[PDB]
Design a protein around this ligand. Structure first.
Ligand SMILES: C[Si](C)(c1ccccc1)[C@H]1CC[N@@+](C)([O-])CC1
Ligand SMILES: C[Si](C)(c1ccccc1)[C@H]1CC[N@@+](C)([O-])CC1
Lengths: 219, 222, 222, 219
């Protein structure tokens, strides 16, 4: 089928700066009626793809003029005059000239903003979860930038890697920060056999890791 | 304007038929558009499944040969998708979208509905509250949490105070463990608003018709 | 002539949507007829659900208000039924039938497909062979049997020698016990053909994708 | 809605004899176009309803002329010049004049034929079922007429009623006979605690009951 090749795969841009992405088709997209059924879409985190450009170079319904599509033949380009926080997400090109209609691989635009240290919080298991025979120590690292961050768990000073599960949120479309939750799951028995539980975060915003911990019996 | 909305099962077993519905509002389906069904796989790859336009004409991708059928009900202004002999590969997010037949503009997509093809059985979730300590209940602000463990299939919709507490909220993507999902969520408010004002975690899990609340109460003395 | 054939799930869980298909052969659905969906309940009471005629026009019984939708796929010459929020009361045999729009003649029905609305889980059947004794293996004729116990949901299709042995056969209606069905079947042949010629019981149970054979072998010395 | 009342509820007829059933509607079925959308159907055992009469009094496509519909207004009648074995099943009337279209309650036609004694056979549990912890003694009573028949189970001379399950087949559309299966289910242990197992059938074809039995250990 007509293959749509998008580049770059990802891309970082400072707010107030222009951006430009490419979409190349393995076959001409102009048809016998002079029309070029080529659309550009933006899928913000957690949302569904939304319209931007249609007919290859036409600004779609209610779309900010900051977006501009161009090109013909097999080479198409999407440009953003000046990136805003809500422009982050994955951009896709879609061709409707050749059946079956196909999408490009998408291009991810990351917003570039000032560094921001994480607000870390740690949480002991709940009384309820305990009585169930389980034990989870949850730790949150919210609103930080850039995405790169390393969290380490320590049970009474010793590092613990097994039974740890992490989850990151996509870049926030409002403040452009990232958040992450790290969870340490243990058997109720192994949990009650130790006293110190620490959550260690390393991030370029401080050469010394951010530390949060607690000891059973206190609060 | 035109708005689409999908509905359908969240879980379907291998070899069975997937049946989805898309209700359209703000425009007659018998006019101008091409009503499409598109799906998005785990790696975020998009695939066009097919459409049925304003005049009832249909067209579908050959990759789904003889397994797909797209029909409509002009009386309820809805169109549908029928996908036979599904396999775990069919697991994805299904969207409906309308684009103008003539030029492809004014495109509008629904919110999407997650569809899981698995033998695993539906399991309601467990909701544990996450209260701080006493070292963080004395400072700038305070972070409270909510742990949702061991459920299937996805998803679960989580809210704080039934949806009135929207800011300072972070709901992390679920992680599959033991064929059971785990998801956490934290909310942040002024260190002087809680516990004066109750904060509740509302967890909903369609697949099992579960709806449970979990109030965040202070540890130790209460 | 025109022939209809239904297909769909045999079991659906409460509150879910029922989705059935009817494939039509020997006539175009866009000509002359009214394509109906009718169902028959346990006590053999029939109810008209609705139709979609050759021009795509629809009409449905008010007893199913806002739960039914009848569409068609002219490309595959099939029409469908969508029934939302089913409950155990919806358990019945669903038929599709075409009658001439103008006068109501030349009506043709499909074979029908059993639909069960229950929480009970699908259980494959057990098939035990029933061989006589030595007092009846010496006389006029001989009767052999086949016992199919504990399965769910209905039905099971049973045959002898994969369908070549049709005469002298009796397959009794299943009886629900412990939320599990039991059904027996006997076949009669000349007292001098068996065991010279093997007789096999073939049991099929769609709901669980089960297909097992059971040869009828003589008791004691073999 | 328009209610369709059928009578009689059931009906027995000798082969080669005429029959006549009624269907009454709570509302006139003739419409403004001079047409009466009223159909008669026959649902033989195990089959789906099939056509007979359409337009209230018209012989439908490929239907034997032995069938004749008549009546107008609210009273409709179906007649069969001379019943044949394959005419057995449930007859239904269906009106398509008033939305929503409704069916009558149906009328069941039973065929009258010469008496026929049952061919009884008894079966001990299977080795396979035994090893599973179960025990079923199956007894068949095939091709008999009339439908009325009483089967009794005896374990070592004593009558047993609990744990017995029966199932009858509808009248056979070829020979007009009936068949039945009686099954006695017991725990493997209770089964092995007894020796004689008998199946007793009483039917008007013999004043003395038809008896079939077996004792464990033999064949
Ligand atoms: C499937 Si679409 C709505 C379309 C797809 C991608 C981009 C723009 C338009 C259009 C429908 C009519 N045509 C003639 O099939 C060309 C494609
Ligand atoms: C639903 Si029916 C195929 C029909 C129903 C019962 C008996 C005869 C005909 C027909 C369709 C056209 N009308 C005008 O709706 C009258 C009823």
């Amino acid at each position: 089928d007509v293959v749509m090749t998008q580049s770059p795969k990802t891309i970082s841009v400072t707010i107030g700066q222009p951006a430009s992405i490419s979409c190349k088709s393995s076959q001409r997209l102009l048809n016998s009626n002079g029309k070029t059924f080529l659309n550009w879409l933006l899928q913000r985190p957690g949302q569904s793809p939304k319209r931007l450009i249609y007919l290859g170079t036409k600004l779609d319904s209610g779309v900010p003029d900051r977006f501009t599509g161009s090109g013909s033949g097999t080479d198409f380009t999407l440009k953003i005059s000046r990136v805003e926080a809500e422009d982050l997400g994955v951009y896709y090109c879609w061709q409707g000239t050749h059946f079956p209609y196909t999408f490009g691989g998408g291009t991810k635009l990351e917003i570039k903003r000032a560094d921001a240290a994480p607000t870390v919080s740690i949480f002991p298991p709940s009384s309820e979860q305990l009585t169930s025979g389980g034990a989870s120590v949850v730790c949150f690292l919210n609103n930080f930038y850039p995405k790169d961050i390393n969290v380490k768990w320590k049970i009474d000073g010793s590092e613990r890697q097994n039974g740890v599960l992490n989850s990151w949120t996509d870049q926030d479309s409002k403040d452009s920060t990232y958040s992450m939750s790290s969870t340490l799951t243990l058997t109720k028995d192994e949990y009650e056999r130790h006293n110190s539980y620490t959550c260690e975060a390393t991030h370029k915003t401080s050469t010394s890791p951010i530390v949060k911990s607690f000891n059973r019996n206190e609060c | 304007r035109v708005q689409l909305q999908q509905s359908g099962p969240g879980l379907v077993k291998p070899s069975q038929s997937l049946s989805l519905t898309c209700t359209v509002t703000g425009y007659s389906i018998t006019s101008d558009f091409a009503w499409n069904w598109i799906r998005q796989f785990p790696g975020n790859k998009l695939e066009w499944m097919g459409y049925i336009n304003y005049s009832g004409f249909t067209s579908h991708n050959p990759s789904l040969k003889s397994r797909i059928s797209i029909t409509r009900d002009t009386s309820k202004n809805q169109f549908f998708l029928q996908l036979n002999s599904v396999t775990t590969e069919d697991t994805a997010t299904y969207y409906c979208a309308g684009l103008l037949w003539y030029d492809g503009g004014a495109g509008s997509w629904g919110q999407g509905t997650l569809v899981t093809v698995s033998a695993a059985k539906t399991t309601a979730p467990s909701v544990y509250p996450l209260a701080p300590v006493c070292g963080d209940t004395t400072g700038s602000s305070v972070t409270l949490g909510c742990l949702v463990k061991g459920y299937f299939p996805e998803p679960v919709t989580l809210t704080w105070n039934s949806g009135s507490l929207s800011s300072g909220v972070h709901t992390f993507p679920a992680v599959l463990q033991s064929d059971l999902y785990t998801l956490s969520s934290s909310v942040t408010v002024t260190s002087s608003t809680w516990p004066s004002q109750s904060i509740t975690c509302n967890v909903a899990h369609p697949a099992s018709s579960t709806k449970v609340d979990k109030k965040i109460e202070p540890r130790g003395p209460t």
